[PDB]
């Protein structure tokens, strides 16, 4: 059950059933958290972290910034992107 956010997030971006919650906003990696708080809800269920929310999840995302995995997209709300896509796969 060893999983990391970026893995989990991607796992959501490969399931169509999750398109109006989280969806690709481009073909070269960028994606958007349409229903941000929900993803958080689920991600806190995947890690068994009940009180999880976007204000905590995003913080993990921001840590990914310097770790060169996921960068924000200035301007576009809830939009992020993998930097080594589609390499990450």
């Amino acid at each position: 059950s060893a999983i990391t956010l970026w893995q989990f997030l991607l796992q959501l971006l490969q399931k169509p059933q999750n398109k109006h919650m989280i969806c690709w906003t481009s073909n070269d990696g960028q994606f958007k958290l349409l229903q941000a708080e929900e993803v958080a809800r689920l991600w806190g269920i995947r890690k068994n972290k009940p009180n999880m929310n976007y204000d905590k999840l995003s913080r993990a995302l921001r840590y990914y910034y310097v770790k060169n995995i996921i960068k924000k997209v200035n301007g576009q709300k809830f939009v992020y992107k993998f930097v080594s896509y589609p390499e990450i796969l």
């Binding site: 059950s1 060893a2 840590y63 310097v66 770790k67």
Partner: protein, 85 residues
């Protein structure tokens, strides 16, 4: 396999990664201060610990009699003098 790699052994040299280093600095400083207290109280002895953050914060633990060394004017200037040359 297991959920995490668990605690992993590291080379005892300088940490080039600004984040792994920063994280490690907290984790340790969190424990060393603990030891100081323990030793201090466990064997009832004076102990002065003084850790200076890579940024600027100066964490410190000091038993009563030593307190006057991070609380006194001279100490403060002395500690302060010891960090800009």
């Amino acid at each position: 396999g297991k959920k995490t790699r668990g605690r992993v052994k590291i080379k005892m040299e300088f940490i080039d990664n600004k984040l792994r280093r920063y994280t490690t600095f907290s984790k340790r400083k969190t424990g060393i201060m603990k030891k100081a207290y323990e030793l201090s109280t466990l064997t009832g002895t004076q102990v002065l610990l003084l850790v200076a953050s890579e940024t600027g914060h100066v964490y410190t633990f000091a038993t009563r009699k030593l307190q006057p060394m991070i609380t006194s004017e001279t100490g403060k200037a002395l500690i302060q003098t010891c960090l800009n040359s």
